[PDB]
Write a protein that binds this ligand. Sequence first.
Ligand SMILES: Nc1ncnc2c1ncn2[C@@H]1O[C@H](COP(=O)(O)O)[C@@H](O)[C@H]1O
Ligand SMILES: Nc1ncnc2c1ncn2[C@@H]1O[C@H](COP(=O)(O)O)[C@@H](O)[C@H]1O
Ligand SMILES: [Mg+2]
Ligand SMILES: [Mg+2]
Lengths: 78, 72, 72, 76, 323, 321
Amino acid sequence: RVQAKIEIEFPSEDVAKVVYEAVLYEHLSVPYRRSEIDFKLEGKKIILDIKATDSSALRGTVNSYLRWIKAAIDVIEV
Amino acid sequence: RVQAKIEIEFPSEDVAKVVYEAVLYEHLSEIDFKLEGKKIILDIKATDSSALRGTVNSYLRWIKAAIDVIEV
Amino acid sequence: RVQAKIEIEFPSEDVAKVVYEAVLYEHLSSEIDFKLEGKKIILDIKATDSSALRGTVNSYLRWIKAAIDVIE
Amino acid sequence: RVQAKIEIEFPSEDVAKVVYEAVLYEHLSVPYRRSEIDFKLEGKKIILDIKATDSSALRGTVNSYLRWIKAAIDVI
Amino acid sequence: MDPMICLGLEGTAEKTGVGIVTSDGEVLFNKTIMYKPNPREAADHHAETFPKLIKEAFEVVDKNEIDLIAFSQGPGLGPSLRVTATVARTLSLTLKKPIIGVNHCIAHIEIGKLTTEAEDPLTLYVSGGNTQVIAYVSKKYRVFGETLDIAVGNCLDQFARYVNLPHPGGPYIEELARKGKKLVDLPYTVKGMDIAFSGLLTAAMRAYDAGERLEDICYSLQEYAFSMLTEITERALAHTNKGEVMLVGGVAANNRLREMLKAMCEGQNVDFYVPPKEFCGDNGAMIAWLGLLMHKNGRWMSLDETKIIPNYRTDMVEVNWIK
Amino acid sequence: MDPMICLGLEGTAEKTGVGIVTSDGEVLFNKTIMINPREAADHHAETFPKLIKEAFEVVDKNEIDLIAFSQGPGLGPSLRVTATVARTLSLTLKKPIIGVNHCIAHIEIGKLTTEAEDPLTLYVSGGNTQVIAYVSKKYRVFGETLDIAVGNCLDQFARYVNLPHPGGPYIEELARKGKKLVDLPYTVKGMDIAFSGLLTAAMRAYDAGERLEDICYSLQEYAFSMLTEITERALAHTNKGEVMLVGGVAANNRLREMLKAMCEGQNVDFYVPPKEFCGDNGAMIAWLGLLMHKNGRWMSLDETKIIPNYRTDMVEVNWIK
Ligand SMILES: Nc1ncnc2c1ncn2[C@@H]1O[C@H](COP(=O)(O)O)[C@@H](O)[C@H]1O
Ligand SMILES: Nc1ncnc2c1ncn2[C@@H]1O[C@H](COP(=O)(O)O)[C@@H](O)[C@H]1O
Ligand SMILES: [Mg+2]
Ligand SMILES: [Mg+2]
């Protein structure tokens, strides 16, 4: 299989919570997933533990989750 | 910053070498791309999440292309 | 503006008169219009605020109640 | 037997709705009434159509509602 | 005593939109950006455009005076709706203000009733991805007639990129249609109050392969499609006993469609309304208004009620703002 | 970034209270103002606007993000004034509103400002006497009073021997000088207590001619022992490691003495909140409303109707795990 572990650290602990909480509901809004994902928050960083079947399956979920996180962060600033 | 670690297991250690060499040689954020046994390790460290997503997309695209040649 | 209009019907026209005269005469000091029309007693009150209106309504409804309680 | 009509006008139409909505839920929070009450909003004024048995029953209901309305206004 | 201000987020289709309206009919801010060519790529476009549009919105109105945040919850594309939703509650958590999930199709109708004389109209929703007849009947907004297969807006796009025309093919087909002046034999498909454009489209491009002039086909494709649209609107209008007819969606920009429907309306003694050009297509202003409409009349939803609804049905809402 | 600021409104029973706390433990504002339920409601209607005005001088009204109020349990007409005032602000300030349980607010303000984490709380109020612990995913009443509350029992006895209405403190003072207990009924049934039987006999001893100081001493001995007993038993039923004393009667030094002695004996901790947070206050309502909302609870106006008999297990705890 193909596994990945992504970590995204934030300036403040409060900022980490805001992004995490916003994205969290999209993490539960997935009925059918292309790969198994664990979306957790540890301190000032958001942990993203993904385990997939193939490389193409991993790319789809990483693109999706990092998109949501990108959208969340870009909003808090400015 | 923002860090990532991807591991890809292959049927044989020889297959891992073929894919590893194929991506490394045909494609010339901070990246660590090494080969450990039958697995290919990918340690990526970027500035922001968008930068990490771009480089991850690139490597996973190349690795995908390499395997598609081997498999039929 | 806070306005109020209360009507109290009585069994006989004489009963209305007794109550009307009893309340009017035994309580002499918001704008108030206190009249008797037939078998019913009309009470037109005009006050500045709600607390002032509540105070005067409490006073009159107490007196009217007291007047009837004597007859019965 | 005993009827009443209370009207409370407000400076603006916006204030009338605010007071009205705050009181409205207390108008529906009453299981047992001392008198039948109609609590509606017409423009900038709040209408109160009350029909009671005796004067004492009307007094209880007016004090209750006017307390709520007064409390609402006193906050704004 | 001050009016409540809502921030609207539109991100279901290709168009990213941000709007700011008050409790009254005043629209403080409204701007929409399109995407010139895929659901995955469209979602990425929203993720890039939304932060940029908000900067411009926060320059017109300071972020502190925003009391409500509304977003298009659906229906629409999966990945696109998620970006919109995530951005919506990201703001909601930051500004510490309430959030409201808004149905896209009704937002089109309600922004029309605000900017047109429509009180209780029968609305014809004609979008790039939608073709429905919606009216408010029996305490809910209901679809009395709608499209099978694809939408006419989609039908015009798909035909355009077939004959090598720019992606927003709708307007370009209309221009070419005037020069045509010859009707082509095409299938007229109407079932009750429902229509189908799949049969019409395939035959239209087959006539293109046949060698019949493109100007004639564009003319013919419009005449057939809009007539079928006019018919089901007429049937639904009589079925619902409404006194008004509304035309919303991007295809409302079509001059011929307006002509055909307005003529039908004048015949049955009913009024015909079309919103301003800015409010016909997808926009953030209409989402802000409907979110404001629902919340001011007493609808609160928590974050767990803000998950995306890709197939949001019109009758799944509860209309609490209609007297 | 910045913390969320909530405005709390306490208007259960006789005490009017207004509080302002942040997302953190910081308390920005807290003030309380001191029978007929009908007249008490009128008192709230007069006092609440003054305190809220006073509160807006410390913290700008624009910086208020949440409005919490004591939804119950409590007196009918009093709860209505609080609620109406609460949502009047909610509509005015255009901010969310949260209905807060009174009894739990006492506990949660207790876990704050003390080292209490998961305690067994002894609620001793003027209208309440309960033993509440968080067990099986809900806050539950394991033991409570039949008839009236002990806080009420001291008041009813005080105004019987011609003492001021807040009789609690005055009985405690007189209790010190007495120093001999009079034979009174010790009424405890299972995990429940009854003070109605204790009260009638206490006033019987007053008519008999025994010194009121002596009676006050004896009334305290019996009442506080009965309270201490069901607390110890409940402690075993819930297997907790802490014991909390909340309510207005928590100001009683003798009651504190008995419970800390009991706790030191059973190897468990004993906590009592600061004097300002023991009795009814607006600060505790603000915190619990903040506690619920911060963990993701929103309620509309139709969920903000008064609940005169609000049960402890009728809440849904989303803030503890
Ligand atoms: N003048 C027009 N005639 C026909 N179709 C149009 C016209 N203008 C826009 N459209 C179509 O309307 C759709 C856009 O609608 P919307 O996504 O709701 O803004 C696209 O499919 C366009 O091709
Ligand atoms: N020092 C005290 N000792 C005993 N009871 C008290 C004391 N202070 C207040 N109380 C009682 O607490 C009740 C009022 O507090 P609360 O229940 O918080 O409103 C009344 O029953 C008072 O008699
Ligand atoms: Mg649309
Ligand atoms: Mg208390």
